[PDB]
Amino acid sequence: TTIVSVRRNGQVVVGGDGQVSLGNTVMKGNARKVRRLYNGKVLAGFAGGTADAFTLFELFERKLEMHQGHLLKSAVELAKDWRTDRALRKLEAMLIVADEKESLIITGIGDVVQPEEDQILAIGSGGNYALSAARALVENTELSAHEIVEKSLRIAGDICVFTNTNFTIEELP
Amino acid sequence: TTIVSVRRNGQVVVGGDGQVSLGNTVMKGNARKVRRLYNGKVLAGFAGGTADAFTLFELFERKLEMHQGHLLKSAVELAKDWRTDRALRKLEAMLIVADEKESLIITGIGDVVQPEEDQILAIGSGGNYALSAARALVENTELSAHEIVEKSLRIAGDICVFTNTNFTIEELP
Amino acid sequence: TTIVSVRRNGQVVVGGDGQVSLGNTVMKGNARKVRRLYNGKVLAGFAGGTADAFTLFELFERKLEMHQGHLLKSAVELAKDWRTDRALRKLEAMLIVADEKESLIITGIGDVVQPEEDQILAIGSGGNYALSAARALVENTELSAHEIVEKSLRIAGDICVFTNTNFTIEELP
Amino acid sequence: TTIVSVRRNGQVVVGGDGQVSLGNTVMKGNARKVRRLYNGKVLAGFAGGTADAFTLFELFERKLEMHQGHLLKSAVELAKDWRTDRALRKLEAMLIVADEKESLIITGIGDVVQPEEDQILAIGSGGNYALSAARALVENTELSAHEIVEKSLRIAGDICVFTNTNFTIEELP
Amino acid sequence: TTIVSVRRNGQVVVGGDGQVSLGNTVMKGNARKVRRLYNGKVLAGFAGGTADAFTLFELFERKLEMHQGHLLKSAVELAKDWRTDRALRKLEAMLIVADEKESLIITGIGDVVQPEEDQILAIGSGGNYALSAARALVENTELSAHEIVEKSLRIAGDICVFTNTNFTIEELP
Amino acid sequence: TTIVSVRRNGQVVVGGDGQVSLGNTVMKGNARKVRRLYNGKVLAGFAGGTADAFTLFELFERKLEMHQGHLLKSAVELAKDWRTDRALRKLEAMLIVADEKESLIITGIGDVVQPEEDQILAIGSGGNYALSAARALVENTELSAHEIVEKSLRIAGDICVFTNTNFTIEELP
Amino acid sequence: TTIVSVRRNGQVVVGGDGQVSLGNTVMKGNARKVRRLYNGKVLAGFAGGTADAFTLFELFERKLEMHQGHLLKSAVELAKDWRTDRALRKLEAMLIVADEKESLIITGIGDVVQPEEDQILAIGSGGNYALSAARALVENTELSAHEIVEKSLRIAGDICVFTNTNFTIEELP
Amino acid sequence: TTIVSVRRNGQVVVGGDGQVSLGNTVMKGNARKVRRLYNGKVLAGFAGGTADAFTLFELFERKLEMHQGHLLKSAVELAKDWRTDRALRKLEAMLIVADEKESLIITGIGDVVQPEEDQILAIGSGGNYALSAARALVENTELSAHEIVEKSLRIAGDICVFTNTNFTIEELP
Amino acid sequence: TTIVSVRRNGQVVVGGDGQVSLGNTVMKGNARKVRRLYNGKVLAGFAGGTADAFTLFELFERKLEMHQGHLLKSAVELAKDWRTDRALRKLEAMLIVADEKESLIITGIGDVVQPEEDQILAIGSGGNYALSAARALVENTELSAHEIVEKSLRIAGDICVFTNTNFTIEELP
Amino acid sequence: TTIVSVRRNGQVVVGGDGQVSLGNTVMKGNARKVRRLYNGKVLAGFAGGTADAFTLFELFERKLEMHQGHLLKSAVELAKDWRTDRALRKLEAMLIVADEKESLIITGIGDVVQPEEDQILAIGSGGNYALSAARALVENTELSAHEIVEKSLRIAGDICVFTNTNFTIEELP
Amino acid sequence: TTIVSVRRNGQVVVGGDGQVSLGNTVMKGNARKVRRLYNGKVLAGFAGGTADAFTLFELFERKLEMHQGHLLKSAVELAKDWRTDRALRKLEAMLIVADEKESLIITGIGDVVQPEEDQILAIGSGGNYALSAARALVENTELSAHEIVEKSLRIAGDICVFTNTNFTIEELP
Numbered sequence A, B, C, D, E, F, G, H, I, J, K: 001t002t003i004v005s006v007r008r009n010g011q012v013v014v015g016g017d018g019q020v021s022l023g024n025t026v027m028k029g030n031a032r033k034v035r036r037l038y039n040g041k042v043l044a045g046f047a048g049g050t051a052d053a054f055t056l057f058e059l060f061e062r063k064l065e066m067h068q069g070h071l072l073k074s075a076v077e078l079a080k081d082w083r084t085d086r087a088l089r090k091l092e093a094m095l096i097v098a099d100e101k102e103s104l105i106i107t108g109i110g111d112v113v114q115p116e117e118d119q120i121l122a123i124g125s126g127g128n129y130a131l132s133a134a135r136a137l138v139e140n141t142e143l144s145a146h147e148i149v150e151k152s153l154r155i156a157g158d159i160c161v162f163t164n165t166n167f168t169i170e171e172l173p
């Protein structure tokens, strides 16, 4: 799995591949791993099971609702519950969330990670290949966030056997 | 075990073999791995223990009763319970459910999987062999869902040591 | 890797994918795994390292030369040396060889092996997926051996994470 | 794999199935597990790798050449080498050898086993099922060695997932 | 343990050995593993602890009472409670029950199971040895069900280290 | 640990050693592993922790009280609870109980074991050495139950590194 | 396996059971584990493979020959070679040797063990059960060495699942 | 991670690196692991997730408030809640807190701990490298606490693969 | 470790980081992992021990010498020996070699890998991060091979905890 | 095993227990583990097999002969041969040797070692218990070396399950 | 164990502690881990078995004799033998060697490591603590090589449980 997000010139993009694997075989090649949340104002990408994703995206929306739409505050609150609720502790996954203000990785191990100054985030088994390609592109070209995400996902798809080249890409605004 | 499902021309078929292997021997040879649930409106097949499967089938029917018979919603709700409940987490198996609208694989690891455009799903140790044969037949012949399921189960049976030639094939007219 | 061979209507075809993997990552995606030997009269596919393949193919040619083009006798002697010499025993590659008369699989651990009446052979991690698709196509369509190999390689490349869709296909017309 | 040997009324028969399983799939289905050695005066069957077996069969014939064709002496000498040689210790398998006087199982763990008064020997994952059926038939019917071997192999085949219905049966008239 | 049942010429027999093992040692050699239930009309054999058996047999009787002697319905309900209750789920015993109409195996993990056309059933570590001997005897002799069970138990007791030769055999004449 | 019981000429004795070990060292060498229960009418020996013993002896007394002092009935009831209560399932141990009528071993794995006709029972790591010596003495001498228990515990103490020679022996009446 | 030796009133006996096991099943039930060596002047019992036994008994005879028939000296020399020869180090087993002067256990771990004052030795998985019974008999009866060996082997056979009751007993003189 | 604190000549300093790792890769290199609490009067460093840290620091502030700035009492109560609540017990972070009076380490497993006479404290995988460098510098130079923390963090960052050289250093002048 | 090679506009470059690690700590941070061979006409990078590197670079030079300086031929010959020589088989590592004609990865598992059409190769734990960045740069910028190698090594150094930023870069010509 | 030596007031004593264990059972309880060498002038204790000890002691004598009774030089040469010869390297015994001048421990892995100012040495699994008791007795009582060794062996025999209380004690008056 | 080497102002010092730990206890406390080799012109220290170390030291001196006393060449040659020789591969340890020109670490895993510009090397479980302290002292004081080594060994000793305060420090004037 590869999910990568880039923010450039007032645009933020989150994109992912479509491969769901079981052991060394492919169960599905067109999964949609990126969704729009909170009245389409938040982009969310997940590396993990769909049902697991629904439970966590559901709660994150409840956090946004009670926390005035503050991404960081909502993210920290989600992480706290995910880290301590006996039910949620069974959900193994990683998430990337982004809104018009900032981008974050949320984990189930009590961490919420902000990006470096280049504003790029990536998760999944192939995430670091997209991250490497994205940083190269951001630091050496004028390409748009959308174009970098597309090119980075492709590079990750050609290296990671668990990442394919069937992408789902969401942009905001 | 091999369970395969094909949907074509308004017909939905789910079938499986009959071999139950204990250790590396044939425990039973005429198991019934596909069943009709929800007043005969749902087909369900399982790869795993018979007792475990019956437990999950009953729970799924309760989810269907709860969510107006909507398959995807019910499957996601079952996957969530399966993922967190102490007793259900001890239940090892994979499920295929199908009604007149859609087909899904349900897992105990937080995944609910929809088929690709071919509308085929397969599970079990021999699942991928039936999947390969079914995809070849759907894309290259005019055979019916029933015929493809029978022919795919037979091909899987000649390759997988744990898959039988004694099939139970159920269809939703 | 997936290498598959089909013989139909006087045509024999051997084709393979192009992925070379190290762990769960791809080192090369355009590998040619099928070669023409014995001045074009023999098609040879291999799952394994290129150095191993070069060694085994050069040794195989030598044998074909001294057995005046007899594939089976040449293969039987190859397998004999393979299990005899401590140097060759270190080679883990798997091979498929085919001429206008017959098709065979040769490995260092299982000596020589012939196909069933359908004359399909497959090796590599994705082999059985290709085999399942090929058997379905031979038994249910009038497709040529080339068409079947191309379609079976594709089906396997869509299921096996170690097999890709960049194929090299050779045919003995 | 199932190899079984029965001696009755001056006839000595050794037979086996034809299934070679790679992982948990049918690698090959028509293997020849029983062979005639020593100018056709010895029958030998093996449970394990084909290459490994051929290596041990060749070594056994050299032992027979060395010890005037005496089966027990040669088997003990083979067992000793198999037990200590660096390369042979890597060879995993069990063997059954039989001539017109006696039958023996040879192992790589320092054992040479003679049959009980029933004069029956069996090896392989399905060996004990064939052993049970053969003992029942020798003690309760007047069937010949050949018939008992065929019927015992078939019974083992319905129980052991790794045993085939394609037999090679050799007899010493 | 080895429990085996054969039905022939209007006679049904269930018999078992008497060894109770803890690790690789024998705690008891004269255990009675076959009992007469439902006032003598039902033969029941079990592989497992005596406390577990007492629990399951008392529960089975209750069901036979409310199902007016119907073995299958009683067994199906037994298996339902077995997988339903957390208390019963802890019971790992395996059972064989037989009346003048039919013979069945019941386990906590595989629910209820019926025999093949030969009407032989077996459970316990030595079960398959008894099954192999019994199938050979049914298919090749005119022996009574009692004779076959006695001879099959003996063959299994001579192969399985956890089965002995002190048998308890019950017959429904 | 070694606990052994012999019943001879109207006398029943239960005795045990005094060693409590942790890993390969001795924590205590004078533990009292045999106690008198039910108004001194029942002898009880335990292989396991003291607190574990107290919990189980406590419950067994409650069983005797509600089951009219019937040892077998009380033992089966204790085993059922021990086998299924989530709390009791954590207690790992074995027990021997004896009254003026009979002797029994109670386990936490759903079994209650009665002695062979020689009326000797033994548990603990050294139990089978005392059992061997006891059977030799019972079958070949006229020694009293008390003397055999004492001599058997001593023999076990000289063989098992986890059994010592500091005994606690209770007799009834 | 159980081999036990007792020396009483000028007679020394070595006896063993006949079971050869592979995993949890019996390969042979009438093996002869005790032999007479050195012109019938030495008794030898072995727990291990037959071929392994032949190699070691062969060398021990060579030691006797060059060491004037001195058992202890010959035993220590055999142990030294067994402990250090790369070939012999592969032989896993234990031996008991006895002559008219003394009895010894020889191991492959650089040890030669003399008996306690009771002059009883035992090896094999069931050896300590025969040892316990033998010591009880020697210390409490007037039975002959032969009778004690026979009764001890029987007691071990009823406890150890890897020891049977088919004995081979040799006496000297 | 490496967090280290040194107190010298009325100055207390706490500093840490900025690497956040997941497995053997870096998720972030500019993390701020040292924060100013209690309106600037308390320096706090942490090894662990940011969500965990936010939780523990908010809880610590609350305690400082009710203990009127008493670091030790506040830390002791923090550690009490940490091991008491099942929610907090899931938090694995390690903390270092320091005010103008004293410096302490607090963890969920080891409660509160104070420094040795040199007043150096360190946590994180690289902690002991920083501690070793700091002890050498305190005992052999006149360097300020700030200089020592900066130099010790650098030495640790050059040895530990999970610690980098992007430091955040806070001082209480 | 990260070694990466790019060939662009008649220039070929091989560069690597300087970190040598033992477990999770750094043994050396300025290792030179790229050398010039064959009279400075060949560039060689290695991921593995220095002594191991010297042995293999030494042999590769011997191959060049006897094979007229043909890189591919020399590489295949080195791989064959490395794959089969008992001494060389102990050397675990990966190598990249380049001359004015082509670039290759040589492994000890019988493989020699040529680059894709972009002519980029990379090995080491961080190799795929440099590979991702290099491909992004080659496909989207006009930067020189030297500049891409430098920027790619840097990106890999910021992600892989086992790769640092102390580079050694060689260019040809 | 426990061997301990104490030197006090011109007396040196070496004593050991008598237990020989195989796994968790006792093969012999009256072993003599301390011997007088060099015509009575050297006391030698050993933890290990008797064959190993015979080998090492005969080799040690030879060295004492050529070093005219010099214990240290003889021991240093012994240790040299021990780690030099592939035959001797297989010997795992541990030794303690003492003469009227000094006491030393010699092992195949740690060469020669001398005692601390208290002149106590101990080897064997129970060694450190004897050492702890001996150090307490030397530092706090006026007891003779013989009394201390006897009392320390007893304390160790009461704690270590592999050490018994049948001691052999030798003293150089 | 902690061995550390520092070179400064023409002085080269190698030192180590004296603790040898067997299991988790202090086997010996005054080991001599640093030795002078090659006619006193080379200093060598080891982390690992004493016997193993002495074997490697002897072999190194032979390499020095072979290569005109050149340290690096000799170290690389030793590393090559250590890497491939069957017996030497069983030798677990790390070495530090130093002469008047250079210092190196030699490993059995194909590595020969030179120090960074600080000219410091350290090995052993406590090596990195001594390394940290030595680097702090070399970069921030004017202490001599000898003083830094002693002070670094002491700091390591307060942190590593396996490192002593009894040092052997050798220097090359």
Ligand SMILES: [K+]
Binding pocket: A156, A157, A158, A159, A160, A161, A162, A163, A164
């Ligand atoms: K991919």
Ligand SMILES: [K+]
Binding pocket: B157, B158, B159, B160, B161, B162, B163, B164
């Ligand atoms: K099958």
Ligand SMILES: [K+]
Binding pocket: C156, C157, C158, C159, C160, C161, C162, C163, C164
């Ligand atoms: K693929």
Ligand SMILES: [K+]
Binding pocket: D157, D158, D159, D160, D161, D162, D163, D164
């Ligand atoms: K089968």
Ligand SMILES: [K+]
Binding pocket: E156, E157, E158, E159, E160, E161, E162, E163, E164
């Ligand atoms: K048995």
Ligand SMILES: [K+]
Binding pocket: F156, F157, F158, F159, F160, F161, F162, F163, F164
């Ligand atoms: K004991």
Ligand SMILES: [K+]
Binding pocket: G156, G157, G158, G159, G160, G161, G162, G163, G164
């Ligand atoms: K037995």
Ligand SMILES: [K+]
Binding pocket: H156, H157, H158, H159, H160, H161, H162, H163, H164
């Ligand atoms: K670092």
Ligand SMILES: [K+]
Binding pocket: I156, I157, I158, I159, I160, I161, I162, I163, I164
């Ligand atoms: K790094």
Ligand SMILES: [K+]
Binding pocket: J156, J157, J158, J159, J160, J161, J162, J163, J164
């Ligand atoms: K003891």
Ligand SMILES: [K+]
Binding pocket: K157, K158, K159, K160, K161, K162, K163, K164
């Ligand atoms: K220490």
